[PDB]
Amino acid sequence: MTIESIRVKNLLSFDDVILRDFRDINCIIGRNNVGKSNLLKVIRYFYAKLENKKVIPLDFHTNYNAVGEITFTFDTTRIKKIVTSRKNNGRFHKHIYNTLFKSSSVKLNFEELIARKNSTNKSFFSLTLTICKDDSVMWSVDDPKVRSLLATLYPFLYIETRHIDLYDWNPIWKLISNLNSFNFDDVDHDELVNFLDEKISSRKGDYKKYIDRVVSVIDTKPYTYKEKVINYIKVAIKGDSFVNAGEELFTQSDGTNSNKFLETLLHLLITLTRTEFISPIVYIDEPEVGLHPKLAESFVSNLNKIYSKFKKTSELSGPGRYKTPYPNIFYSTHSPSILKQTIKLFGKDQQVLHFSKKKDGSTRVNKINSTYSDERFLNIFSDNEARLFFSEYIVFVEGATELELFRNLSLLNLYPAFSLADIYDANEVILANINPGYSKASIPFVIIKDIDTLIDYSIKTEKFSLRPLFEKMIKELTKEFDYYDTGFGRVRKEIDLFSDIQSSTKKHMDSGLFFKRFSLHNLSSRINKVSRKLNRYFMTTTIEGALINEQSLPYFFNWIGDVILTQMTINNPNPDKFIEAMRRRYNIKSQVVPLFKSVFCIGLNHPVYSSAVDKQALRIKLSFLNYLKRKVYSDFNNEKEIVLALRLAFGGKTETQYTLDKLRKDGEAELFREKIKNYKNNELFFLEPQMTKTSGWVTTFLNYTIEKITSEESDDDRIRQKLSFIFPEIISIIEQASSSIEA
Amino acid sequence: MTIESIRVKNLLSFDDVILRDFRDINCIIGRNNVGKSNLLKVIRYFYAKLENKKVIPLDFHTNYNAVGEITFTFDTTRIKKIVTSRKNNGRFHKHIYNTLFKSSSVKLNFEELIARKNSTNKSFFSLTLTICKDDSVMWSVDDPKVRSLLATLYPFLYIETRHIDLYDWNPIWKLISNLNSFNFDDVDHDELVNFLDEKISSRKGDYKKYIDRVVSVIDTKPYTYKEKVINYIKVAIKGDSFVNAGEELFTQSDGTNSNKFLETLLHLLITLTRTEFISPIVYIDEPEVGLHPKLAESFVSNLNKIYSKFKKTSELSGPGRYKTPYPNIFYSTHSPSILKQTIKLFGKDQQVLHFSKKKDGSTRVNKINSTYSDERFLNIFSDNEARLFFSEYIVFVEGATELELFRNLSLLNLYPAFSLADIYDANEVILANINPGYSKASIPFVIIKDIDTLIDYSIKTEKFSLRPLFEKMIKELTKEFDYYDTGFGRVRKEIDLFSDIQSSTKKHMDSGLFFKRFSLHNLSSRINKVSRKLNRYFMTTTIEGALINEQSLPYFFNWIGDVILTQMTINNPNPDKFIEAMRRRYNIKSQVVPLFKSVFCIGLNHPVYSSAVDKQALRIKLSFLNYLKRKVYSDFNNEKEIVLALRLAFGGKTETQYTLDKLRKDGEAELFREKIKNYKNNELFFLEPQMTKTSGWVTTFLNYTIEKITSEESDDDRIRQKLSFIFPEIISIIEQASSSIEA
Amino acid sequence: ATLYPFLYIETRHIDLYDWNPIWKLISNLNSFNFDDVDHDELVNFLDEKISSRKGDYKKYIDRVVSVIDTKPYTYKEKVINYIKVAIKGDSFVNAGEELFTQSDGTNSNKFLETLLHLLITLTRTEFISPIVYIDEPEVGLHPKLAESFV
Amino acid sequence: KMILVDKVFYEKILSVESFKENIITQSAIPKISNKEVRLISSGSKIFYAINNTSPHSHVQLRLNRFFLSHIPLNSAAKAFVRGGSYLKYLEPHIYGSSYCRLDISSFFNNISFDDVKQSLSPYIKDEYLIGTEQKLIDAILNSVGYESPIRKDKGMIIPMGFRTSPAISNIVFRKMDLLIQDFCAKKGVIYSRYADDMLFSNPRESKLLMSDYFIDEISSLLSIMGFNINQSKYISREKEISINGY
DNA sequence: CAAGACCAATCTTTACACTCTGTGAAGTTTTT
DNA sequence: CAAGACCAATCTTTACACTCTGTGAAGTTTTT
DNA sequence: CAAGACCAATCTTTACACTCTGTGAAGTTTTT
């Protein structure tokens, strides 16, 4: 490894933040203004003060602390192995020994030294920089040679891709100079000059005279090591100025230029760090800025290709594969493509860090689970799943109807806060391998399911039966296995009755369509109150039942009236004569149903008719409206039967958790099923194509309801309260999600 | 409107490009290096030369043309209405009349002038700038006052968000100065000085003396209009320097700073352009750079909120709503979030422009369909759907198994080109309302379906029947309705036999599991050859059948052998005594099946056993392997029956397009169904959980097959050819997609 | 343009603390042959000189070359690289002291002095005859320093 | 990257099998004999049609497919080019106020073959295809050109209806397209060409297109490589022109 | 009759020697 | 005989009203 | 009696080998 931990106390936006357990790739994600670049500034200042540069000290998070501390724990196990060995007697190795590992092995005795040598070596070097209130800086190690050597051994390479100079890639060479280490004593400036003069002269000695003249005229300073290696590279290679795919930089784009710059630099880093013991830490800001999603994916793919091409394992070995640890690569991204490709192509060698600024202003760093044990999920992992990492509140659902509802534009207009929550339908296995409960504190979430997934009532036996999900939930909820007393006695009682519910029996009425005295609403409320600790919300019925309740019957009926008035047309190219013929053949009163069947049919396009045709159509439509009102209020005894029939037609469930298909298969409620089929095939034929779940009736219903109620009432608080009254179920979930989002 | 068209000929990356039919929001999308910013450079140079600035001429696309032309067609209908009217007798109006609309209404006579006045007014002003090979510039209108006035009336406001100075928002004020027009004759520098002196003096006259001194000392130039309005704004308002949410800019982030800068500027633009006749054109590059996806969505949402708050329609009217045309806002983005929110919140007022650089190097601009008539699709529109706009090749599929296959990491490793193609499962209604055939040239695509969607063979009647999708496809394919002869005679013949296939009958064998002489492969090949023109590919069988063919039987069987050897363990905490007890109670030979049922069970975790236990388990496993080999080759007459049984167990179809559930419902093939159930319940019980479509068997199968064949063969061309041989169906589709991607 | 190069300085806008624009002008002055010096013999020479085990430096240069994408050197870049490798130091120092510690007049005087000295010294052997134009050779200079410069 | 053709390019993808016998026996590629060309009369015009069975037709077709389609052209040439159409020739002139139309007399017959050789030389490598007898460029022009039997005096001629003749005409006239386009641009005139019919339009209020000076200048340019202006079809009008009914 | 203006691409442009300095003793339409 | 191309300078170009939004009911030489 | 805080300067800090990768088997005044 390279760095064990980084700790910041009271500097910039950090109160007390510790980052550890670094992996080969560390993806940093988080909202805008959470401190992602503040880590960069802290590390940059720490390394600038490491080399004794003169810079302004960073600002304190709060002024009620007299200190601000930065702690770095360098991992010197591999360097200790490098230098302690008797073979490496070089001068650089001798310096590293005499600076770092001397005076540390001095204090240890023979027994402890031998124990360290023989056992699994683990040596760390902890360096703390403390900034006082008067801008003075104090180190925990008072030997500046140690700090300079630590800077040399673990160099910090740093890019903000936003401020890259696209048309001049010179800053690459400097970074290359930081990477590789070798000997320069043998190469003087005399042998090289003689070689060049012998190669460049029609008469021997001329080039040496020229260089002597230039040297005599100028006054310079001896080369530093990095300048030496840069000069030798630049002389050795064929060209200095950079060219993108055979074309000059200024003709190319900006995204292409930045992508190629980053790609070449990272490729050089990984390629050149193989043979040396220098372990850099590289920090990229926005590796995706100005890049097409395809280009960002390709950038990560090429990075992983180079990373895996030099990686040696128990199976992969041979020429060109090294065990040398890879440099610690941090990059802060706001692009789901970068994160998705990072996860999919790295697996266990990547780490996702979430930066969130809390309520007071401190930054919190958390680790989001990005390793999955399921290969199928890794292969099927796509942009939609990777988008979840950037969410603020994830509302997991089960079917597509909930997606249709919670994404409604008009509904989100009146609840802007819920616009920040991403809805994602999750299967049970997908929800299991995502592990949203691991984050919880990082990304709050809720899992929305129907109560059918818990209890399956049987009409024949008049018994509830517990699904295995209920047993598993109870098993996590019987916390009392190894605990102490707390105000959880109510929880134990609730679990006791939840286990007791199995043996109880409840009678049903109307051949199994209602409960005599059992209140499924009360059971749902108790279940939700108990299971709020598990972030799971269970609805009493299906989502169609939630939309269509006894209170929502009027507006829905109004929609029927509107769907009776506007969106059908006349099924003939000759409205006048056709309407006359159908009025003649079919009576207004006795045969209104076949007359409406023949005349009107659903059509998106509305041709304009004559005024008399409009009058006739309006009279027929009003007559049909009155007839349907009378028939509906006659064939059904109370409003509850009508609501249940509407739920069943659209695909909902009864009070006993039975669908229309389930009732047909089991054979119960023959009379109600026959009435529903009669209403579908005779009077409500035009609504038949809209009866299905995926037909999009939810969107039209919600849009019309919102528009109508906004027409009735003007104030937004009034409109929200009316929405809460009319849909007590959905508005509650939206309110809960928004309240959790606000905090 | 503001701009009718923009045409570029032979300049920068454009050969002959015309952009027209602008809407209120114009989202520009396209790959890196396609010319999206070249439009910006062309417009910027055109407007710089409009004001007679001295700049270098832009480079020619190809040097074989002696000219390079930029044409702008300004829409002056509203300005003509403004100025022609007798009420507006101001000096600015008089100048606009005497410069633009004079000498244009001069040539017209009374009849034509009255016709223009009374009818729907539509007046355009076409200005062409031609750059010759010797850097000279020639206009089509030789009056510089006209060009300066056109620049003033239709100002170009331009931002590259990448190079924004975050900590100084001064460039806002300049742009504000470009927006609003009013009178300044009454405000001199004498009344203002007297007012300020009267307000600022303990003794009257002091401030006037001070200003007189300052004026006398300095030497200046009279104010321009924009400086005047900027000064008056800056004096009038409470503060100049900008602050983000009560905090100073340098303490805030970079993404937050850029987001707030863009938000305030666009808000000012739309708010201030309401009352004036000046119609700006604003061009934003990368409105998303450095922004969290949530922040980009919120940016577009606020933009739409401001846009709709001032928009007046037949229903929305009253105080604060204007009919004034909105400025033309272009922004080039690479973020799916920006495009998604733009589409969802604008609808018919947005336009998506696709920039693609072809093969020679010219830029192509196309319009991608971004308006949907389905409200349900608009509400359900999400990141996954909006990602399709950035695709290079869309492979629409039907079920999740194809998604599992085509996203396989190992499979994509050997076909890197297909990594650039995004796979998206599309329902029939989703595929209908996406309208992928409208783009085609912009974003090439293919729709992958099973032949079952075309023809439904009946075993009882021995007849093919044509699904309505076949009739609809034939209806688009009978092009000959109003055409002329071409080499389409073969197509007409193929459609004739496709209609004839209905009346034909084909016998079946083995109770309806094979075809006597009919070759479904031949029919599939003919259908695909005919329908390639419609970008639809039909597979002979389901995807499970495509994976499991007669040729893939060996490797699959090897997988079974491997799934027999590795991934089960012993179902007991005491392997030694348990294995001894089961060896004692159940014989090795006679009762191998119950012995393996009791001993081995599938388990992800593999505890380490004693060497003798490993030996016993290996012997038992080898015996079971031999027994299964013998039983499988005995109970099935030929290899084809085994392949069909494997397809049916996993959920495929037979040759007659019948699933296991379909066969069970219809009752045919009782013997084969009984054999399959016996093999599932007795010998292949361990594979039973992996029998389902969503169990992920495809991923494991493909991974193991790829790893094994790569172990056998080293060369990548060899490995690809082996893949093509072993899966002739999937490799063909990948090859076709890659070939279409390359061109 | 190549035969009679124009060298041009406005002493007012001189970057005092970075004397890099000297090297470019030096590249304009002198003319000689570069066909014999390839990038293979030099690499072998450096690798033989810089290696505890033969061949390592050549492998390193091959890796760097394979990763990057560049454009062939122009002549002036070639001569600049050969000078900068040959001489003992690149960064400039005034009388043993770093530039940023020294003055502004001293820095400008030394810059102009070294550049003109290099011009006259190096133009002796070649047929390339430059035209050099200095603006304000005296700005920021004490009268004694201007006299000494001339 | 411009298109370059070498010996392998001719022998593998161009010839394929048409002249395999000549390349294996090192025998010179022959002239297009009169036996392979039939002479049609349409109006006063004479058309030359090659027989399909001859290998020359096939090599002309593959030359058109793979070689002449890659040489860059001039955007003022709207005819015989991929994506060029008459409406494109007539469109840039909607911006003009005065119109003029000129014609080149016998455009295809007046194309000098030496000009064709000079125009195609940079795009074909200078090699010896057949020993030291016939060069590659000579063989390709032998495939492309023809000798008129009616008029043997003018020698090799690019005839009407030789498959590759239109593309070769555009390539050889690119030089004059550039010259005339530059002249018109300096005069502020929009210029376009379809085959040999040239159309100019002035968007300014001026009489330049109706003057004899413009005709004289265009003729003086056209005399560089020997073309002439058909004086019968010369037309100049204001505010409205009709070209073949459009 | 005859004439100025006759594409744009296409290839190591950096020193030599005697002289340490001097350069030398079976569709429409268009072109047709 | 008659014709395209007929200097460069020279002057408040920023809103109005009814309509709080829409635009309207006694030297030489040269030209000579 | 005895004790934390004991100047600032002063010297090649960039790789080795077996292992092409791993690190190892005769003035005044002041101090006085």
Ligand SMILES: Nc1ncnc2c1ncn2[C@@H]1O[C@H](COP(=O)(O)OP(=O)(O)OP(=O)(O)O)[C@@H](O)[C@H]1O
């Ligand atoms: N000197 C300072 N003192 C205190 N707090 C500061 C200081 N500088 C910055 N901050 C805080 O740190 C944050 C600065 O945003 P920062 O750049 O650290 O986050 P980020 O996630 O990188 O932003 P972005 O997502 O735009 O890149 C803000 O919360 C700001 O209040």
Ligand SMILES: Nc1ncnc2c1ncn2[C@@H]1O[C@H](COP(=O)(O)OP(=O)(O)OP(=O)(O)O)[C@@H](O)[C@H]1O
């Ligand atoms: N002077 C020029 N002459 C010819 N082609 C040019 C010139 N400048 C740029 N180009 C071409 O135009 C393109 C430049 O990319 P451009 O910035 O126009 O595209 P872009 O889509 O904006 O890029 P990005 O997606 O990175 O923003 C390249 O194809 C380049 O070859």
